[PDB]
Design a protein around this nucleic acid. Sequence first.
RNA 1: AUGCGA
DNA 2: TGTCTTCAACTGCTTTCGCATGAAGTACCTCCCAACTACTTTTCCTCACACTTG
Lengths: 57, 52, 45, 387
Amino acid sequence: KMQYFLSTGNLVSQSGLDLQQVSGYTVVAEKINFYRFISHFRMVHRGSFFAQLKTTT
Amino acid sequence: GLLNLGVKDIGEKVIFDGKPLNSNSGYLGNKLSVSVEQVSIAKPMSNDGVSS
Amino acid sequence: TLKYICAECSSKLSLSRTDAVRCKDCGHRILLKARTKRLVQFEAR
Amino acid sequence: KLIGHEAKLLFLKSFQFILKRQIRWLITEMRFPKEFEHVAKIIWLKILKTINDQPQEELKLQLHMTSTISILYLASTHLSLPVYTCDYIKWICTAKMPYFQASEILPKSWRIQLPNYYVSILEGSISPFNGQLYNKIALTCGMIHFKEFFNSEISCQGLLLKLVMQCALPPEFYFYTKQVIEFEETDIRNLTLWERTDERHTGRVSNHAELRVLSYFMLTINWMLSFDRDRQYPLKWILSLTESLTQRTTTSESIGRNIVKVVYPDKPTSSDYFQWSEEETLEFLKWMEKQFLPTQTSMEMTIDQKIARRKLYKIFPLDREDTHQLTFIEDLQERYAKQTPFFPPARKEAIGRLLTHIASQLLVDFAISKEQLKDCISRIKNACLHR
RNA sequence: AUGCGA
DNA sequence: TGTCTTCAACTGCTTTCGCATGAAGTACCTCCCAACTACTTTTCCTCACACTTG
Ligand SMILES: [Zn+2]
């Protein structure tokens, strides 16, 4: 179950973990460049749900 | 570690087999408390042909 | 003699259609196909 | 993987094979030219002759572990090169024969030739009990009609020599016993190998010549010793021949007899097992690290079961994590000197003391019968008193 | 569908 | 009897065009499979007792 969820990033549970989305939590390390590899672990996302918002505030 | 606190927080899940006994008819007398005490994680290993 | 190197012991070997795909010297299950004396032409650019 | 007639044919074949391998080590060990080789061939050619005749679906043949040496024994007797007990002890001690394990062959494949009420039963099933050793030599003679075919069977003035030197090399006892043999021992005539005991009950008629030779040997010592009125053999002399003997190293021989003792049979040598005079202990482990390797080579097992095994041996690795010991006639000489000092109820006891010992020795090389032996003894005892 | 190039 | 008014629920959309590279669900069930060990299987081998003898 944790390989599947960790292989798709569609985390679903009976509480929703109190999180605004049920996908997108996981990303490919995409080692095409050392810059990209180190940059992945210093990247932080405001979350997809705010990506859906039309505003910019 | 955080995971053992989590399993210490999930506590128990109780189920009564409808303890027939023939209070013994609405107090059942059939308690089953299922829980998880510890959670262990082991480093990756592979044994082939199984165990042996 | 065709060759296959064990990915984890370096030991050279020569697999056959009649043996287990495993390093007979270590027991690994991953084998690199060895390079041989085979002609390849190259334009020097 | 073959059952029935053709399964038998290669069980036949394999039997064919190992005997031949047996014979050539025979030549290397004894260097007894075309002669030893060809007589042995036709002997089994003769043996094969009969197997074909009662064929149809006759499966009584598959020879025993012993039939092969009986064959080589019969052929040698023809040639009259040696002896049985000596041959057997030598063979066990040096594994000269491939007799013990049947994996050799050239079979790899004959091995797989499945077993078919056969091939698996071949090569190294068990070690001989009592006559059993001959309980087939006679049968082979039966199959062979060997006595008519081959000259001078069971004979050998060499077994007598082997026997006197065997221990109390009392030079005079050679023709003492040769003389009693001369006497009533088949009307003063060299004992010939018994007949083709055709009957399956294999009665103990004791005609196995040697068995009687050893019997005359023992008797001779007892009688001659019992009545040496002139007192040619001193009271204190008899036990000396005992003290000197009771064990000792062996320029190969005694070490061999230990190796035969270790068939742990009727417990006459079992304890020798226990005792095993220090080094005897050591040269034993030497002969195990050399001739036990003739041991073996699990199959497939992903290399796994095997590798692990290799590692384990990698582990205890070991095998080393006057040339000292002496030859046969050296030991023989030195105990003949250890008795160097030659020139009532007690001596009788000493004599019985000594006879039990030889009974141990001669009996131990052979199928014994801690009484057939003496049954045998009893027999000629009876034979004798018709003067 | 995710990330992404213009 | 006839006509009018507000609110809340429901409908349909709100950048284009392509690479990648497709992968992964899953309870309930399992019969098949691989295993360790023991037990069992087919052919073969070899000795043995009694009655009677003299
Ligand atoms: Zn390896």
